[PDB]
Write an enzyme that holds these catalytic residues in place. Sequence first.
Site, PDB file in Angstrom:
ATOM      1  N   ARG A 138      38.464  70.106  29.904  1.00  0.00           N
ATOM      2  CA  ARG A 138      39.136  69.402  30.992  1.00  0.00           C
ATOM      3  C   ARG A 138      40.606  69.723  30.912  1.00  0.00           C
ATOM      4  O   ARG A 138      41.236  69.543  29.869  1.00  0.00           O
ATOM      5  CB  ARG A 138      38.943  67.888  30.801  1.00  0.00           C
ATOM      6  CG  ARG A 138      39.631  66.992  31.836  1.00  0.00           C
ATOM      7  CD  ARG A 138      39.178  67.357  33.305  1.00  0.00           C
ATOM      8  NE  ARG A 138      39.586  66.290  34.248  1.00  0.00           N
ATOM      9  CZ  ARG A 138      40.769  66.239  34.858  1.00  0.00           C
ATOM     10  NH1 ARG A 138      41.757  67.077  34.509  1.00  0.00           N
ATOM     11  NH2 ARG A 138      40.998  65.344  35.813  1.00  0.00           N
ATOM     12  N   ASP A 186      44.889  66.399  38.167  1.00  0.00           N
ATOM     13  CA  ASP A 186      43.653  66.027  38.823  1.00  0.00           C
ATOM     14  C   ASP A 186      43.538  66.731  40.158  1.00  0.00           C
ATOM     15  O   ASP A 186      44.418  66.593  40.991  1.00  0.00           O
ATOM     16  CB  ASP A 186      43.525  64.540  38.963  1.00  0.00           C
ATOM     17  CG  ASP A 186      42.080  64.120  39.262  1.00  0.00           C
ATOM     18  OD1 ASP A 186      41.119  64.748  38.771  1.00  0.00           O
ATOM     19  OD2 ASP A 186      41.981  63.154  40.028  1.00  0.00           O
ATOM     20  N   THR A 187      42.387  67.381  40.360  1.00  0.00           N
ATOM     21  CA  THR A 187      42.067  68.022  41.640  1.00  0.00           C
ATOM     22  C   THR A 187      41.217  67.089  42.430  1.00  0.00           C
ATOM     23  O   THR A 187      40.540  66.221  41.848  1.00  0.00           O
ATOM     24  CB  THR A 187      41.350  69.404  41.519  1.00  0.00           C
ATOM     25  OG1 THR A 187      40.070  69.232  40.840  1.00  0.00           O
ATOM     26  CG2 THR A 187      42.181  70.406  40.689  1.00  0.00           C
ATOM     27  N   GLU A 237      37.964  65.934  44.266  1.00  0.00           N
ATOM     28  CA  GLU A 237      36.555  66.215  44.040  1.00  0.00           C
ATOM     29  C   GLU A 237      36.007  67.203  45.071  1.00  0.00           C
ATOM     30  O   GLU A 237      36.552  67.330  46.193  1.00  0.00           O
ATOM     31  CB  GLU A 237      35.715  64.916  43.994  1.00  0.00           C
ATOM     32  CG  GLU A 237      35.533  64.400  42.547  1.00  0.00           C
ATOM     33  CD  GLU A 237      35.239  62.912  42.461  1.00  0.00           C
ATOM     34  OE1 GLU A 237      34.746  62.342  43.465  1.00  0.00           O
ATOM     35  OE2 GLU A 237      35.479  62.316  41.381  1.00  0.00           O
ATOM     36  N   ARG A 275      34.714  66.256  26.412  1.00  0.00           N
ATOM     37  CA  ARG A 275      35.291  67.530  26.862  1.00  0.00           C
ATOM     38  C   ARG A 275      36.573  67.808  26.056  1.00  0.00           C
ATOM     39  O   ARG A 275      37.328  66.883  25.774  1.00  0.00           O
ATOM     40  CB  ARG A 275      35.658  67.443  28.354  1.00  0.00           C
ATOM     41  CG  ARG A 275      34.432  67.237  29.262  1.00  0.00           C
ATOM     42  CD  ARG A 275      34.809  67.122  30.722  1.00  0.00           C
ATOM     43  NE  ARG A 275      35.583  65.958  31.049  1.00  0.00           N
ATOM     44  CZ  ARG A 275      36.047  65.633  32.257  1.00  0.00           C
ATOM     45  NH1 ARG A 275      35.674  66.318  33.363  1.00  0.00           N
ATOM     46  NH2 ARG A 275      36.927  64.699  32.388  1.00  0.00           N
TER      47      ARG A 275
HETATM   48  C1  THP Z   1      43.070  64.770  32.005  1.00  0.00           C
HETATM   49  C2  THP Z   1      42.245  63.696  31.312  1.00  0.00           C
HETATM   50  C3  THP Z   1      41.068  63.163  31.874  1.00  0.00           C
HETATM   51  N1  THP Z   1      40.384  62.194  31.188  1.00  0.00           N
HETATM   52  C4  THP Z   1      39.199  61.545  31.734  1.00  0.00           C
HETATM   53  C5  THP Z   1      39.601  60.260  32.496  1.00  0.00           C
HETATM   54  C6  THP Z   1      38.578  60.290  33.629  1.00  0.00           C
HETATM   55  O1  THP Z   1      37.465  59.442  33.325  1.00  0.00           O
HETATM   56  P1  THP Z   1      37.416  57.901  33.898  1.00  0.00           P
HETATM   57  O2  THP Z   1      37.622  58.025  35.397  1.00  0.00           O
HETATM   58  O3  THP Z   1      36.035  57.402  33.381  1.00  0.00           O
HETATM   59  O4  THP Z   1      38.400  57.221  33.054  1.00  0.00           O
HETATM   60  C7  THP Z   1      38.003  61.685  33.669  1.00  0.00           C
HETATM   61  C8  THP Z   1      38.264  62.386  34.984  1.00  0.00           C
HETATM   62  O5  THP Z   1      37.642  63.625  34.964  1.00  0.00           O
HETATM   63  P2  THP Z   1      37.360  64.442  36.310  1.00  0.00           P
HETATM   64  O6  THP Z   1      38.671  64.251  37.043  1.00  0.00           O
HETATM   65  O7  THP Z   1      36.876  65.726  35.845  1.00  0.00           O
HETATM   66  O8  THP Z   1      36.227  63.682  37.032  1.00  0.00           O
HETATM   67  O9  THP Z   1      38.713  62.452  32.673  1.00  0.00           O
HETATM   68  C9  THP Z   1      40.833  61.777  29.936  1.00  0.00           C
HETATM   69  O10 THP Z   1      40.203  60.828  29.345  1.00  0.00           O
HETATM   70  N2  THP Z   1      41.963  62.221  29.410  1.00  0.00           N
HETATM   71  C10 THP Z   1      42.731  63.189  30.034  1.00  0.00           C
HETATM   72  O11 THP Z   1      43.800  63.631  29.514  1.00  0.00           O
END
Ligand code: THP
EC number: 3.1.31.1
Length: 136
Positions: free
Chosen positions: A35, A40-41, A43, A81
């Site tokens: 990740r 954030d992109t 969806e 991830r």
């Molecule tokens: C960038 C990043 C995302 N995330 C998690 C938070 C989001 O889950 P929650 O919404 O359950 O808290 C998820 C978003 O991923 P996606 O944006 O791939 O869906 O990635 C982290 O925990 N730490 C980070 O640094």
Amino acid sequence: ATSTKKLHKEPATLIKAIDGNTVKLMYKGQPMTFRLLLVDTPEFNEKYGPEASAFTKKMVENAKKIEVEFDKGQRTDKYGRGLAYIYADGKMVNEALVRQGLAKVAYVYKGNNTHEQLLRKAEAQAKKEKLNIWSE
Ligand SMILES: Cc1cn([C@H]2C[C@H](OP(=O)(O)O)[C@@H](COP(=O)(O)O)O2)c(=O)[nH]c1=O
């Protein structure tokens, strides 16, 4: 005084681009889903989602050299991830998505914020330019 180690780039091999902010790589001989830090992109079903997926995909599929850089803080997220900056031939994917207005700076934790200012600078240019998510 003593220091800690300076972040560093580790090579990895593309397995599959997943979406605008997730890529699967062969890292030290094992698959890991990464990740992207600090971004954030949209969806895939939201507006600009397919464009964000395609951008990341092209960038990593075209790259001769992919590198992973973990930040100073947490290395994995709650879902298992890896959390990293990803580079494609020396160009940071996280930064290129933000600069294009295909990702917002997001999920900024102070433990893991090394390239925050670099990405905010990218976001400010994309917003001035009214690209993609900033166009309205
Ligand atoms: C960038 C990043 C995302 N995330 C998690 C938070 C989001 O889950 P929650 O919404 O359950 O808290 C998820 C978003 O991923 P996606 O944006 O791939 O869906 O990635 C982290 O925990 N730490 C980070 O640094």
